[PDB]
């Protein structure tokens, strides 16, 4: 149920990220959704050991489902790109990206 909801958001996230391949807004939206994916699923500790945490995955996805206004810090590997952005905004961007692929 809530599991069904999470699963559906997972489908969308998987489909939109790392595909093959116009305007500059698209470039930023693609990067933001990739950094979001990394925030949820690729957390590491100091010294870069993988931090596996099912509760973290559930919590992030639950906040995405609820379009939480909570803001999160998304950073590129090289620390050059930094977004401070709400789950609400990420949710809207995800749904739009998925929708545009269906066209």
């Amino acid at each position: 149920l809530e599991n069904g909801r999470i699963a559906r958001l997972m489908f969308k996230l998987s489909v939109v990220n790392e595909r093959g391949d116009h305007n500059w807004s698209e470039t930023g939206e693609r990067l933001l959704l990739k950094l979001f994916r990394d925030y949820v699923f690729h957390q590491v500790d100091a010294d870069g050991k993988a931090r596996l945490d099912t509760n973290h995955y559930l919590n992030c996805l639950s906040k995405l489902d609820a379009s939480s206004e909570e803001q999160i810090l998304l950073t590129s590997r090289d620390n050059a790109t930094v977004f401070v952005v709400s789950y609400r905004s990420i949710r809207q961007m995800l749904d739009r990206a998925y929708g545009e692929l269906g066209k």
């Binding site: 305007n23 500059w24 807004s25 930023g28 933001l32 977004f83 401070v84 961007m93």
Partner: peptide, 17 residues
């Protein structure tokens, strides 16, 4: 070559090229 608008968050708003 262009004008760009984004929220202060970095969320894209529009792009004109």
């Amino acid at each position: 070559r262009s004008v760009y608008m984004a929220a202060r968050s970095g969320v894209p708003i529009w792009s004109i090229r």
